[PDB]
């Protein structure tokens, strides 16, 4: 029949086309939060549509018995819903919800299929998806377990607070308190939020933890525990759901420093190593395995892919002549990139408030620019025709800069300063042509843009589908619910698809907790934690699986003298000397702890410290003259690690060459005191750990040094257009009785009126700490926004800011977000996938070039590895045992057989369940049935124990897994023993639980059997050693910048981030700060109080004993201390990441 004309149309182009623009104006329509009545036009027209595609699709392939035709093609079934559903919902509404129309986003995924490549890109998604099976259930196993711990240990010690004090009063039957007024019912008093302590300067209640370190609650207050939670609720660890999901944030490293110093804060300092133990394997290390699996599974199917694909004449050419003559002189090329570059320098020299005639100046400069860009535009063109001028790509960008530069200016008469810069901004990227790593960064952004443009699309549909998702089922929740008795929402909501995309992109860069909890407290727990579960999962897998595509794509394609001085060198010869030296370091660097606040009053110690002082100089001067005295000045000056030693022994000197000599102690002479810093550095070049992780670091300098260039231009165009933008509008007006935020504009407007209305000394126009003044703030923020931390305060600073020099309001920019999420997109995002990729380059090829393959490890490092690796062999051969004589015959007929394995690893997942159901203040008769079943259970072990011990007599002892079961069985018989023994002994919180934590040994016994957890943990056994290497570096440098803080960063005013138990004033509370500092979390918060300065936010001149005259620390200094400590930080992050990287390749792929 006429079906040869619908299987005719079904393969045509304009179907596709005419599918597309429909799907793409539904998309634009679906994107509302209150459509108007008119869309029965619009919704039928599409539903009509959609019925037709549909219609000609079963036309092609149907008429009966559909099998082995349409609806074999799983897309198929999509389409079907949606036809389905789109009549469905015209003649009933029995089940009125509302909300089956967030069903309508589903047909907004058949864009997926109309396009013929983001079906082969989801393909591969999935694909890799399913190698992740054993990743998954890894890391829920030992988030279970780290969450188990945390349970046992922190069980209710979220819940404290420093509650005000109280009598029973003796006044009423039962329990009633007296405080100023009369309460009752005790719990009544507690429960009220009245009886609390506002932490300073933030709206938290103080928690405080009644122990000798944590927390202190103050004079008239107890610390005590009772109360709902802090963030609403959705913090403690107090049932295994809650514990759970706080370690998830952990692993997830979201917002993972205020659980962090509320819990130490609680619960006991000495409690950060279980912190320095989850932030190390947990998130660390499971964030680098999947990224290592998903990049493995990319590259095998890659492999895969690519192995299948293998199978008016006299004047006119007089004048032409001499000019392609002159033009083409390389030196012309060498003026004009000093041109350009002089350019460059020239828009960054705008800053916040210039001189008058600066600015005329600039554009004088910037006109003679033009001048000459203009005059080589002609005297190149005159070179050729443009049949030839107007080809090679790069000749038709440079037109297009100067035609655009040209039309700006001659638009001078006119309103335009925020993107007419833009248009002179480009010429930058002029310089990308004859640079070699300009080229790597533009064939990254085009390799993205334009060959894998597949996956950025697929992200770009699920960011879409997410927030009409989230718009859809959240809009109207918000909007009563939230905003305030002022009416204004909050600053991440749903009611508009601009703030739900986004909340989307914020859940992708890694903050999702929050605006979770904002969701929760009004939505539902259940819906609103599945969604924001699914985003967080989905996209960072996607956006992971991105960042290693670009990656390897784009990586892939007399005579006396001369017997005292060999006797003299004799002793350097003998390793005893070395090991006194090594000693005598040791020392000399821990003496450098003590430098804390509480020196000067101890009066004692003091003295000793200077002797000490004295006498390593001097023992470190001798033994460098030695030195000397045996290596000659060649071999030692040539060293260039004994050339460190003698530049610390330089300062050394001249410490003691000035105080005791010239009585100076003023000016740049205490600078040097607190440059001896530095003497930690020579335990560098002797703890071969050390120098071989130096040697690799240093080896991969040039190339870091290429890309810190480039990313520094491309910061550098960004930091230009911030400034551009954001100089001048940052200053906001602050009443200081009760004031840290603008004053309501319609009434403070401009700094005019801040400043004419200052008839009480309240009024402060005090601008942003990180704000876009001039270039050299601007990279600052840049760092702010592309680390995540601090941004949100940048972003609400620049989105409300309305003009130059004015109060800001409430989102009168809101469109400025685009700005940084363009940021984020290109430079944060494609700079580090440049920058890990170079590394990982460079230290590929480094470990080429060599021969023992691996770095990172010494030699007896490299022996013990390769001892390591022949553990976890192929195959252990089978032991086979002797059967048994009679009695142990009979015995083990039944023990030996393969289902007792697998029912004792049954009965060992239900004692994990049992586990589970714990609780804060559970029952008093609930307690007993629990222990009465862990008791039942430990029985059970000790029984199957001692049967599998009666099977085998001496064959018992050989599976190195099976000792392992005995040694958690006599553990836990000693645990149920010693459960109630006490009775006599101190308050053991810290010794019951300890000796209760025990039973988690039954728990690491299910991976016997487990090989997909098996290998991942053999993953890490084997790479233990470079880690240790690594982490005594940085321990090395936590040590260094910790003695650098506690030099200059005590006596800092306590504010943000620097509290009275996170601070510079001693060797834990500085180390503290620099553990939590090393993932680069809320240093944001710790550099505010330091860039303090006089009055507001500060006050010199205060009397603090050592450093007096203090109270805020200066800028300068902290900014160079964190913003390097965070570069450093990072570099040693990705060597971890490389050394797990290698590790994980080395044992899958060999087996
Ligand atoms: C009971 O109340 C009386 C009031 O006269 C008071 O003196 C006494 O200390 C109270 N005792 C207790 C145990 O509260
Ligand atoms: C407890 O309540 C009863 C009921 O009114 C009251 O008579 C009694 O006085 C109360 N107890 C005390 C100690 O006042
Ligand atoms: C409040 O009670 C605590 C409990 O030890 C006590 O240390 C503190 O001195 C009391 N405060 C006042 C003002 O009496
Ligand atoms: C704090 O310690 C005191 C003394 O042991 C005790 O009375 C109080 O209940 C404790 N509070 C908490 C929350 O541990
Ligand atoms: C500042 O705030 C205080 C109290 O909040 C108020 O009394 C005073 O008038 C305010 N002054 C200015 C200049 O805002
Ligand atoms: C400032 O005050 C005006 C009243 O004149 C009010 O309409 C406005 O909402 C206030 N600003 C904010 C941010 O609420
Ligand atoms: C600031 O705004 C006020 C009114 O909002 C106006 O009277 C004043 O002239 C303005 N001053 C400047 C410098 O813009
Ligand atoms: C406002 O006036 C007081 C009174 O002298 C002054 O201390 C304060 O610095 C002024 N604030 C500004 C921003 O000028
Ligand atoms: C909180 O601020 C008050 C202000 O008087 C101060 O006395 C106290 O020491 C501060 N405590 C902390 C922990 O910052």
Redesign the pocket.
């Given at each position: 029949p006429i079906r040869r004309a619908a299987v005719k149309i079904l393969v045509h182009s304009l179907f596709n086309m005419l599918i597309m623009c429909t799907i793409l104006t539904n998309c634009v329509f679906m994107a509302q939060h209150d459509p108007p009545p008119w869309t029965k036009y619009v919704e039928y027209t599409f539903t009509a549509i959609y019925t037709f595609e549909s219609l000609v699709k079963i036309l092609a392939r149907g008429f009966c018995l559909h099998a082995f035709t349409f609806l074999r093609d799983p897309w198929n079934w999509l389409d079907f819903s949606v036809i389905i559903m789109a009549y469905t919902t015209e003649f009933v509404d029995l089940g009125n919800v509302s909300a089956l129309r967030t069903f309508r986003v589903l047909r907004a995924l058949k864009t997926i299929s109309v396009i013929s490549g983001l079906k082969t890109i989801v393909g591969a998604l999935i694909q890799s998806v399913k190698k992740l099976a054993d990743v998954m259930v890894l890391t829920v196993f030992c988030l279970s377990v780290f969450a188990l711990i945390g349970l046992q240990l922190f069980m209710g010690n979220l819940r404290h607070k420093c509650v005000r004090n109280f009598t029973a009063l003796n006044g009423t039957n039962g329990s009633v308190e007296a405080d100023g007024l009369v309460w009752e019912s005790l719990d009544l008093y507690l429960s009220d939020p009245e009886n609390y302590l506002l932490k300073n300067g933030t709206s938290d209640v103080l928690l405080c933890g009644n122990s000798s370190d944590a927390g202190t609650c103050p004079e008239g207050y107890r610390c005590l525990k009772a109360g709902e939670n802090p963030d609403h609720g959705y913090t403690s660890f107090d049932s295994f759901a809650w514990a759970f999901l706080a370690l998830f944030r952990l692993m997830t490293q979201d917002c993972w420093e205020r659980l962090y110093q509320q819990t130490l804060r609680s619960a006991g300092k000495i409690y950060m190593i279980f912190f320095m133990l989850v932030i190390f394997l947990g998130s660390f290390y499971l964030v680098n395995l999947i990224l290592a699996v998903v990049a493995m599974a990319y590259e095998e199917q890659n492999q895969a892919t690519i192995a299948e694909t293998e199978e008016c004449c006299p004047l006119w050419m007089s004048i032409k002549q001499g000019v392609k003559l002159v033009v083409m002189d390389p030196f012309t090329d060498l003026t004009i990139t000093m041109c350009i570059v002089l350019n460059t320098l020239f828009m960054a020299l705008e800053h916040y408030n210039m001189t008058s005639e600066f600015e005329e100046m600039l554009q004088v400069g910037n006109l003679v620019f033009t001048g000459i860009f203009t005059a080589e535009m002609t005297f190149k063109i005159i070179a050729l025709d443009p049949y030839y001028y107007f080809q090679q790509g790069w000749n038709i960008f440079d037109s297009i800069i100067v035609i655009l530069s040209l039309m700006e200016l001659g638009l001078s008469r006119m309103s335009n300063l925020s993107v007419l810069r833009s248009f002179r901004l480009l010429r930058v990227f002029k310089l990308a042509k004859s640079w070699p790593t300009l080229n790597t960064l533009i064939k990254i952004i085009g390799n993205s843009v334009g060959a894998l443009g597949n996956l950025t699309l697929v992200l770009a549909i699920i960011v879409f589908i997410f927030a009409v998702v989230g718009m859809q089922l959240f809009g109207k929740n918000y909007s009563e619910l939230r905003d305030?008795d002022?009416?204004?929402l909050p600053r991440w909501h749903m009611m508009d698809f601009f703030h739900a995309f986004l909340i989307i992109f914020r859940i992708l860069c890694g903050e999702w907790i929050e605006t979770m909890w904002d969701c929760m407290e009004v939505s539902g727990q259940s819906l609103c934690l599945l969604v924001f579960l699914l985003v967080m999962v989905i996209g960072n897998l996607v956006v992971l699986n991105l960042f290693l595509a670009l990656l390897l794509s784009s990586f892939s394609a007399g005579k006396v003298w001369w017997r005292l001085r060999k006797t003299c060198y004799h002793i350097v010869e003998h390793s005893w000397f070395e090991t006194f030296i090594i000693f005598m370091i040791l020392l000399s660097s821990g003496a450098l702890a003590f430098e804390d606040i509480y020196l000067e009053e101890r009066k004692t110690i003091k003295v000793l410290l200077e002797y000490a002082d004295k006498m390593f100089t001097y023992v470190f001067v001798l033994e460098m003259l030695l030195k000397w005295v045996a290596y000659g000045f060649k071999k030692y000056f040539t060293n260039a690690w004994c050339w460190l030693d003698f530049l610390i022994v330089d300062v050394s000197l001249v410490s003691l060459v000035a105080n005791t000599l010239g009585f100076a102690e003023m000016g740049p002479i205490k600078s040097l005191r607190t440059l001896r810093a530095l003497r930690p550095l020579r335990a560098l070049s002797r703890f071969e750990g050390m120098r071989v992780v130096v040697n690799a670091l240093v080896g991969a300098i040039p190339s870091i040094m290429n890309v810190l260039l480039v990313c520094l231009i491309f910061w550098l165009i960004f930091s230009i257009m911030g400034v551009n933008l954001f100089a001048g509008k940052f200053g906001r007006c602050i009443n200081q009785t009760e004031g840290d935020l603008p004053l309501?504009y319609?009434?403070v407007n401009n700094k005019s009126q801040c400043e004419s209305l200052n008839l009480t000394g309240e009024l402060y126009w005090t601008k942003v700490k990180v704000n876009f003044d001039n270039v050299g703030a601007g990279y600052l923020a840049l760092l702010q926004v592309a680390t995540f931390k601090g941004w949100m305060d940048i972003m609400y600073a620049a989105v409300d800011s309305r003009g130059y020099e004015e109060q800001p309001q409430?989102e009168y920019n809101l469109y400025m977000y685009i700005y940084f999420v363009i940021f984020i997109i290109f430079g944060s995002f494609f700079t580090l996938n440049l920058f890990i990729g170079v590394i990982i380059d460079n230290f590929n090829q480094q470990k080429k070039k060599l021969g023992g393959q691996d770095i990172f490890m010494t030699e007896e490092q490299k022996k013990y590895y390769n001892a390591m690796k022949k553990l976890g062999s192929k195959k252990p051969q089978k032991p086979i045992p002797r059967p048994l004589n009679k009695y142990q015959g009979f015995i083990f007929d039944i023990v030996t057989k393969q289902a007792f394995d697998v029912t004792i690893m049954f009965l060992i997942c239900l004692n994990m369940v049992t586990m589970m159901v714990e609780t804060d203040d559970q029952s008093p008769e609930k307690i007993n049935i629990l222990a009465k079943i862990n008791l039942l259970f430990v029985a059970i072990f000790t029984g199957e124990c001692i049967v599998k011990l009666a099977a085998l007599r001496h064959y018992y002892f050989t599976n190195s897994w099976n000792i392992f079961d005995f040694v958690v069985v006599i553990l836990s018989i000693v645990g149920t023993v010693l459960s109630d023994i006490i009775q006599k002994y101190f308050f053991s919180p810290t010794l019951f639980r300890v000796i209760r934590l025990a039973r988690i040994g039954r728990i690491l016994r299910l991976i016997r059997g487990a090989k997909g957890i098996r290998t991942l943990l053999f993953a890490l056994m084997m790479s233990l050693p470079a880690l240790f290497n690594i982490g005594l570096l940085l321990f090395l440098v936590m040590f260094i910048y910790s003695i650098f803080g506690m030099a200059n960063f005590a006596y800092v005013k306590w504010e943000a981030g620097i509290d009275d138990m996170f601070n510079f004033q001693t060797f834990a509370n500085s180390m503290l700060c620099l553990f939590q500092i090393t993932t680069s979390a809320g240093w944001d918060g710790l550099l505010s109080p330091i860039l303090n300065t006089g009055p507001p936010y500060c006050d010199p001149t205060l009397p603090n004993s050592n450093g007096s005259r203090g109270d805020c620390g200066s800028p300068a200094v902290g900014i160079l201390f964190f913003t390097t400590y965070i570069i450093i930080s990072f570099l040693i992050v990705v060597n971890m990441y490389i050394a797990i990287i290698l590790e994980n390749f080395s044992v899958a792929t060999e087996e």
């Open positions: 305030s002022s009416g204004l309501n319609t009434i409430w």
